[PDB]
UniProtKB/TrEMBL annotation, chain D:
It comes from Sus scrofa. It comes from the Eukaryota. This is NADH dehydrogenase [ubiquinone] 1 alpha subcomplex subunit 8. Accessory subunit of the mitochondrial membrane respiratory chain NADH dehydrogenase (Complex I), that is believed not to be involved in catalysis. Complex I functions in the transfer of electrons from NADH to the respiratory chain. The immediate electron acceptor for the enzyme is believed to be ubiquinone. Residues 77-110 form the CHCH domain. The gene is NDUFA8. Belongs to the complex I NDUFA8 subunit family.
Automatic annotation (TrEMBL), chain G:
It comes from Sus scrofa (Pig). Residues 54-82 are annotated as: Disordered. The chain holds residues 88 to 169 of 169 of the full protein. Complex I is composed of 45 different subunits. It comes from the Eukaryota. Belongs to the complex I NDUFA3 subunit family. It is found in: Mitochondrion inner membrane. Accessory subunit of the mitochondrial membrane respiratory chain NADH dehydrogenase (Complex I), that is believed not to be involved in catalysis. Complex I functions in the transfer of electrons from NADH to the respiratory chain. The immediate electron acceptor for the enzyme is believed to be ubiquinone. Transmembrane segments: none annotated. The gene is NDUFA3. This is NADH dehydrogenase [ubiquinone] 1 alpha subcomplex subunit 3.
TrEMBL record, chain H:
This is NADH dehydrogenase [ubiquinone] iron-sulfur protein 5. The lineage of its organism: Eukaryota, Metazoa, Chordata, Craniata, Vertebrata. It is found in: Mitochondrion inner membrane; Mitochondrion intermembrane space. Disulfide bonds join C32-C65, C42-C55. Accessory subunit of the mitochondrial membrane respiratory chain NADH dehydrogenase (Complex I), that is believed not to be involved in catalysis. Complex I functions in the transfer of electrons from NADH to the respiratory chain. The immediate electron acceptor for the enzyme is believed to be ubiquinone.
TrEMBL record, chain J:
Belongs to the complex I NDUFA1 subunit family. It comes from Sus scrofa. The chain holds residues 92 to 161 of 161 of the full protein. This is NADH dehydrogenase [ubiquinone] 1 alpha subcomplex subunit 1. Accessory subunit of the mitochondrial membrane respiratory chain NADH dehydrogenase (Complex I), that is believed not to be involved in catalysis. Complex I functions in the transfer of electrons from NADH to the respiratory chain. The immediate electron acceptor for the enzyme is believed to be ubiquinone. The chain crosses the membrane at residues 1-18. Complex I is composed of 45 different subunits. It is found in: Mitochondrion inner membrane.
Length: 175, 318, 98, 122, 96, 100, 82, 105, 347, 70
């Protein structure tokens, strides 16, 4: 079973996406997003991306959606909408799981599934490379090259964040 | 045997939390000219058992009537994350050795706020919701400085690996190198753990019980255990980061003793601070961080970037 | 393409469909936006790690930097909408027509 | 397209340097100092050819030279080297720092009996 | 003090990297031989496996180029035991 | 598998305690006990986000210190930090940091 | 003169900002005039992260050594003295 | 309207990350550096229209290295037929593939 | 909004578009789009009204979806080619997704529904920026990827845009909505020639930009957002309404006015590629645009609508602010037809 | 008096000491009397795998020295 941990995680990722995509109250949506973020971190870690996946755990889960939650709390709704609360939400939730199951089964049964692209049912372990990175974390060096090579990216991103602060101030002015 | 190691990390930490409660009570009493619990057992050693049993046998009130799933997840998440954050700590050999254990602990601390966030909301009360919001702001506000200060000090470590902190501080404590950062980091730990003078969340004097006003019996006990476990874990992180200890590879017991003693000293410092100062006003708390601390942390971060380059003391990556 | 790519592309498609089909709340749609961004981060990270494109391992980070900028903009708009109407409901964004 | 020309099993059979990582690391400096020529030749072959198959013989020569290096160590400095690598094996990171005294003993013996000089830093 | 100790640490790191450099050629030879042997075993077992399948060349390269391509994990460990596959794929990631 | 084991064990232990604390004491026999303002200061939360972004951008610095172009690396790192300080100063001076 | 008055007022009323600006200014300025920065660059260069791939000897490369421990090639004595 | 200001002013604003075979830190090679280098060297100065067909072999090899669809298809066929023969009982995996021999170091 | 901040936001918008038109790396092009959105949103809400907030929210949602689809297309093209360079796109699905995203950014139908609403919500100056400057970046991106573009999808979107722009305008009495529908139709005209000859798209874009600049500046000068408020203008500033009539006739494409040359050259290029039915349908469908232009002209200048007594007060005063480029924009929008062969400069 | 606080601190000290000693001794027991090898980089994991193959009992901590040679 440990042979397809990545696939199990990807299925959980899709399930969380169906959860927050069916639009329950933003509380449960936040829960689905949090679960999906953790699971994406798991997949990234499995592929060797410890730092990148951990970034989602902190700057995405404990970041963008940590305020998403703080926001919903300020705009409190009368009732916590759940999947079963609206027949459509529950129906779409079930259909989404069913859709995943259909493609999953087809991919496994039909060695080569083709929804919009062509996918092979072989385990993800196949695609991995047999090279050695030596005394290095390739992800770490690539990310740290943002200061040595990606100076232009640094400039543009910093300017965007400053203008984002100014923009948020201006939008929340309200005159 | 790895499961045995997990249990050895978990259960003693819970026992330490239980007895930390008694230690806090006695220390606060003695600093107030009083004697801590001493009737229940010799010198009060059996008081935590009585407290726990009384809590558990107590009525399980629950007028939440909203998202009971959340009202149950919040204690689970809090306790689970409190126990997990202990895992990567090297004492001196970590249970799980991560190249980025530091960022892992930062992420787990950020997640742990959701426990307070949900508990207060699913309670669906007045103090609970507003108090939970004040919590989010408090932890969120100090999370920024916590990260900056941590990055600034690790610039000397050369990695986010907790284990290498022992090697880096082999000859001297990092407090000598970064004491201003150490002071700000200590205050940051105080804020993150929601301890006095930043005990605004619970804030009994102002908010009847804060986020846990609608939590009783066992779930309240789990919140208490999570709080105290976070206190001990954050003090242990401080001890590892700044007050390094000598580690003899052949006898880890010496390092373990030294580390435990330093963490105990820092926890006693936490209780001491709780006794001495009054509570910062919610507004004053944020003023102290974004307007007063955040600047100095930025300046010290620039300095700690520049120093290894201008002193040719760039630490080894491995 | 391995099945993980299929799953993540499916997640992005599902999130896109959810965003394009609002129900009442704007926050749910903003949740779908953040979710689509997560799918894109995971897909980009998997591609870059598998191909050992060392110099592109920062692209996922910049994507998230701008993902949070977009989220922040969305919340900054949502608060104003709520102030003007009392709810985040989409049906109140009705003054402009055609 | 074409068939991959994988070499036979017999040609790729070579005598193996069956020593653990700590043992290799203990002798790493003197091994590099003594066995440099075949190792550098094999590396040049691998990097120019970019085919593992093309440079099998150079790898065989590297393995043989390593075996000769270790045979000489066994002949002349067996016990000090054993103590050195047992010291190194204890440390999880296999650090050189903790075993400086055993390193000095091994270096002194190897300089006396075999005349090898440990290469300097850099 | 930190400057002195960090300079010494960089010196020791250079020493350790020099040791790795000294040992690298032997490891490269061993790795190349192991990869070739694993590929040969896969090819032989594959000929036995797919002899009866029609219109299947054995060991036909999937790339047009007649140049060595580093085999993926799937080629080398395709038909080994699951424990070997789990080790080769996720050992360094999971080891802690 | 070690990290997965640790996560599983911790979560199961905490959930087990929640069970023994939500249901086990709930058996004990008893009787019947009967039983928001729009925060515009949420701007602080939004500013945290954009500052957390710079936090993320700054984390690679320990490995960034290992490059050979230390001049360019230092210039860009101080550039990002000075832009963050400028953002803080702007929000401060424009009374945007109106906490509570 | 007025600058001294501004500094005194700033230290009296906003000492934290004064400390921060002083530290940031030093962090900006000092590395430029520090002699050891080039030493840090050289140290980072000297670290042998990747293998030193040998080069074919065509008989016209006096400077490149033929073997370690030969006098030709770079030296790390400066770091050892450091 | 792609004003090639980078080429006019000789500024490498973003072309460093354009390809996987460009210079990378510590000369860490890409997984498909050889194929990409060959494809670019083939498709240099001949124009996109010519490159789409006169370098199709290089591009196909590059795509195969990137995605390995054909390699995975071949391996899937091998595993299918091995399972089929095992069910029929006319195949027995070798002891070394079963783990009965120590792999080469 | 503080004027320094307003200038910084406008420069950020322009810098985002410059990054879009300057970068050879897809990630940076998407970054430029993100900067454009971030800077644009507060600019749309310079004057704070509930309508301004609603328009900003709609625009943000639409552009955010477009950017997300664009980034997914970039990621897919990376997955199948491993190239970040803006060039031929090597996956048809990525090409289709990118085309949909860029069309949504341009307001091409059936992604047009947001253009009239956003234009009505925002002020005349924000509308000018939205309908002139914002079009530059996506059109640049499409021109760079023109070869990969599937001609059928682009042509269908162009024809639908022309049809819908013509239809919607007939029903509108709000000047801003009329301008938005005209913009939709002209965007369809520009994107029609994109598969065939990009220089024609650039020429049409320049002519359209001049005409819309002139029209919006005339509306700002007249301070009219409705047909009747514009009708009142003849009593105050007859020259303004006369020039408005001339610019409207140009926008309709009537010869010998400058508005004729983009349509003429587009028809030429399409016919050279054996497209005969499509240019014919586009030219005929432009008559709806011409119709509502003519109705606006009847309301404004050709016929004198009733005024109000209080206008006698405005007679005494004069316009304080002068828009320097308005006369030259009018001249270029109306009298540049004798100078088409200069269409080889942008070539 | 204040020394009465000490017994609780001592119990807490023992409880905190237990996990570190437990981890150290469990690592020693599992890794054959030596510290658990730390693999922060793929080279170290490659060394561990090579040691596993060399040992012959599929345990890396088992160390083969000069005796295996010739």
């Amino acid at each position: 079973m440990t042979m397809y941990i990545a696939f199990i995680l990807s299925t959980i990722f899709v399930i969380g996406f169906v959860g927050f995509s069916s639009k329950p109250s933003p509380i449960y949506g936040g829960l689905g997003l949090i679960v999906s973020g953790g699971v994406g971190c798991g997949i990234v870690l499995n592929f060797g991306g410890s730092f990148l996946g951990l970034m989602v755990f902190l700057i995405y889960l404990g970041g963008m959606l940590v305020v998403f939650g703080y926001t919903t709390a300020m705009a409190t709704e009368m009732y916590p909408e759940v999947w079963v609360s609206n027949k459509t939400v529950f129906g779409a939730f079930v259909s989404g799981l069913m859709m995943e199951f259909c493609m999953v089964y087809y991919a496994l049964k039909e060695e080569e599934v083709e929804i919009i692209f062509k996918f092979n049912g072989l385990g993800d372990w196949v695609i991995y490379d047999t090279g050695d990175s030596g005394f290095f974390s390739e992800e770490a060096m690539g990310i740290a090259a943002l200061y040595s090579y990606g100076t232009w990216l640094v400039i543009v991103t910093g300017w965007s964040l400053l203008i984002g602060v100014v923009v948020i101030m201006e939008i929340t002015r309200g005159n | 045997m790895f499961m045995i190691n997990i249990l050895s990390l978990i259960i003693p930490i819970l026992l330490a939390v239980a007895f930390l409660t008694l230690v806090e009570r006695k220390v606060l009493g003695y600093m107030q000219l009083r004697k801590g619990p001493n009737v229940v057992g010799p010198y009060g050693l059996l008081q935590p058992i009585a407290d726990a049993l009384k809590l558990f046998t107590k009525e399980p009130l629950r007028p939440a009537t909203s998202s009971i799933s959340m009202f149950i997840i919040a204690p689970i998440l809090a306790l689970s994350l409190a126990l997990t954050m202990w895992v990567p700590l090297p004492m001196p050999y970590p249970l799980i050795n991560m190249n980025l254990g530091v960022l892992f602990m930062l992420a787990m601390s950020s997640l742990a706020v959701y426990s307070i966030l949900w508990s207060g909301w699913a309670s669906n009360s007045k103090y609970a919701l507003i108090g939970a919001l004040r919590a989010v702001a408090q932890t969120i506000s100090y999370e920024v400085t916590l990260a900056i200060i941590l990055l600034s000090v690790l610039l000397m470590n050369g990695s986010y690996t907790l284990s290498t902190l022992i090697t880096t501080q082999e000859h001297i404590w990092m407090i000598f190198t970064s004491w201003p950062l150490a002071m700000m980091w200590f205050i940051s730990t105080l804020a993150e753990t929601n301890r006095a003078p930043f005990d605004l969340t619970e804030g009994e004097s102002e908010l009847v019980s804060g986020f846990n006003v609608e939590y009783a019996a066992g779930p309240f006990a789990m919140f208490f255990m999570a709080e105290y476990a976070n206190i001990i874990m954050m003090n242990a992180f401080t001890a590892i980061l700044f007050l390094g200890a000598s580690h003899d590879p052949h006898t880890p017991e010496l390092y373990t003793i030294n580390f435990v003693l330093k963490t105990l000293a820092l926890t006693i410092t936490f209780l001491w601070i709780r006794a001495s100062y009054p509570r910062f006003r919610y507004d004053q708390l944020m003023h102290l961080l974004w307007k007063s601390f955040l600047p100095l942390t930025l300046a010290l971060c620039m300095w700690h970037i520049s120093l290894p380059i201008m002193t040719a003391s760039i630490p080894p990556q491995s | 393409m391995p099945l993980v790519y299929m799953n993540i592309i499916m997640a992005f498609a599902i999130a896109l469909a959810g965003l394009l089909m609002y129900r009442s709340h704007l926050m749910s749609s903003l949740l779908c936006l953040e979710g689509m961004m997560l799918s894109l981060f995971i897909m980009s990270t998997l591609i870059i790690l598998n191909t050992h494109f060392t110099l592109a391992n920062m692209m996922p980070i910049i994507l998230l930097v701008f993902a949070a900028c977009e989220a922040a903009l969305g919340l900054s708009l949502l608060v104003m909408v709520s102030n003007t109407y009392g709810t985040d409901y989409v049906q109140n964004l009705n003054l402009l027509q055609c | 397209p074409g068939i991959v020309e994988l070499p036979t099993l017999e040609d790729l059979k070579v005598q193996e340097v069956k020593v653990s990582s700590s043992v290799l690391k203990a002798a790493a400096h003197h091994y590099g100092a003594q066995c440099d020529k075949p190792n550098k030749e094999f590396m040049l072959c691998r990097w120019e050819e970019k085919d593992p198959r093309r440079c099998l013989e150079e790898g065989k020569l590297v393995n043989q030279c390593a075996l000769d290096f270790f045979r000489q160590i066994k002949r002349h400095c067996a016990e000090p080297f054993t103590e050195y690598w047992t010291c190194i094996d204890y440390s999880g990171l296999q650090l050189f720092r903790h075993c400086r005294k055993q390193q000095a003993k091994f270096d002194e013996c190897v300089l006396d009996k075999l005349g090898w000089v440990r290469p300097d830093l850099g | 003090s930190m400057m002195k100790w960090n300079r010494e640490r960089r010196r020791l790191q250079i020493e350790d990297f020099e040791a790795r450099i000294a040992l690298m050629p032997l490891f490269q030879a061993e790795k190349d031989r192991r990869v070739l042997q694993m590929l040969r075993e896969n090819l032989e077992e594959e000929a036995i496996i797919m002899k009866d399948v029609p219109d299947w060349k054995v060991g036909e390269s999937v790339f047009h180029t007649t140049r060595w391509v580093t085999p993926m994990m799937g080629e080398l460990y395709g038909l080994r035991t699951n424990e070997e596959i789990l080790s080769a794929t996720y050992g360094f990631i999971w080891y802690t | 598998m070690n990290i997965m084991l640790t996560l599983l064990t911790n979560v199961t232990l905490a959930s087990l305690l929640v069970l023994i604390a939500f249901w086990l004491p709930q058996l004990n026999a008893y009787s019947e006990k009967t039983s928001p303002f729009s925060m515009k200061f949420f701007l602080v939360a939004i500013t945290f986000l954009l500052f957390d972004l710079e936090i993320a951008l700054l984390l690679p610095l320990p490995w960034a210190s290992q490059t050979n172009n230390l001049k360019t690396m230092l210039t860009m790192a101080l550039f990002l930090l000075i832009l963050l300080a400028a953002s803080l100063a702007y929000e401060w001076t424009q009374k945007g940091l109106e906490w509570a | 003169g007025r600058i001294a008055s501004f500094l005194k007022n700033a230290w009296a009323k906003e000492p934290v900002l004064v400390a921060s600006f002083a530290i940031g200014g030093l962090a900006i300025i000092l590395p430029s005039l520090s002699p050891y920065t080039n030493y840090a660059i050289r140290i980072n260069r000297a670290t042998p992260y990747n293998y030193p791939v040998p080069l074919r000897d065509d008989g016209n490369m006096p400077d490149v050594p033929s073997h370690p421990q030969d006098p030709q090639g770079p030296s790390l004595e400066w770091l050892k003295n450091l | 309207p792609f004003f090639d200001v980078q080429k006019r002013l000789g500024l490498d604003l973003d072309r460093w990350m354009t390809i996987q075979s460009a210079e990378q830190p510590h000369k860490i090679p890409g997984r498909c550096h050889a194929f990409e280098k060959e494809w670019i060297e083939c498709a240099h100065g001949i124009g996109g229209i010519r490159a789409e067909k006169e370098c199709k072999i290089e591009f196909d090899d590059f795509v195969e290295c990137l995605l390995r669809q054909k390699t995975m298809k071949r391996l899937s066929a091998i595993k299918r037929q091995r399972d089929k023969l095992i069910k029929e009982g006319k195949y027995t995996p070798p002891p070394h593939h079963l783990g009965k021999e120590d792999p080469r170091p | 909004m503080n004027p320094i901040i307003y200038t910084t936001l406008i420069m950020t918008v322009m810098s985002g578009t410059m990054l879009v038109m300057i970068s050879s790396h897809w990630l940076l092009i998407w970054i430029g789009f993100e900067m454009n959105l971030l800077a644009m949103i507060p600019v749309l809400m310079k004057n704070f009204n509930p309508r301004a907030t609603e328009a900003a929210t709609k625009y943000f949602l639409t552009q955010a979806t477009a950017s997300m689809m664009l980034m997914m297309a970039i990621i897919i093209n990376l997955l199948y080619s491993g190239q970040w360079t803006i060039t031929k796109m090597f996956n048809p699905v990525a090409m289709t997704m990118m085309t949909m995203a860029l069309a949504m950014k341009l307001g091409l139908s059936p992604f047009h529904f947001w253009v009239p609403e956003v234009t009505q919500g925002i002020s005349l100056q924000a509308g000018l920026l939205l309908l002139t400057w914002q079009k530059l970046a996506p059109l640049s991106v499409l021109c760079q990827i023109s070869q990969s573009i599937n001609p059928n999808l682009m042509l269908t979107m162009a024809m639908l845009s022309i049809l819908i722009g013509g239809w919607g305008g007939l029903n509108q009495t709000q000047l801003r909505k009329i301008m938005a529908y005209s913009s939709i139709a002209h965007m369809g005209w520009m994107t029609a020639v994109l598969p065939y000859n990009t220089t024609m798209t650039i020429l049409n874009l320049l002519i359209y930009i001049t005409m819309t600049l002139a029209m919006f500046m005339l509306l700002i000068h007249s301070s009219a957002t409705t047909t009747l408020s514009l009708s009142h203008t003849w009593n105050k500033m007859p020259v303004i309404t006369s020039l408005m009539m001339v610019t409207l006739l140009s926008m309709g494409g009537l010869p010998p006015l400058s508005g004729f040359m983009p349509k003429w050259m587009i028809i030429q290029e399409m016919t050279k590629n054996e497209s005969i039915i499509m240019p014919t349908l586009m030219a005929m469908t432009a008559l709806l645009n011409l119709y509502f232009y003519m109705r606006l002209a009847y309301s404004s200048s050709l016929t004198m609508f009733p005024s109000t007594n209080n206008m006698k007060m405005k007679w005494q005063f004069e316009h304080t602010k002068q828009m320097k480029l308005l006369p030259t924009m009018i001249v270029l929008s109306t009298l540049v037809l004798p100078m088409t062969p200069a269409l080889s400069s942008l070539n | 008096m204040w020394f009465e606080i000490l017994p609780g601190i001592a119990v807490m000290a023992a409880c905190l000491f237990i996990p570190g000693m437990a981890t150290a001794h469990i690592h020693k027991f599992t890794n054959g009397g030596k510290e658990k090898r730390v693999a922060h980089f793929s080279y170290q994991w490659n060394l561990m795998e090579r040691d596993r193959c060399i040992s012959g009992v599929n345990r890396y901590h088992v160390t083969k020295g000069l005796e295996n040679i010739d």
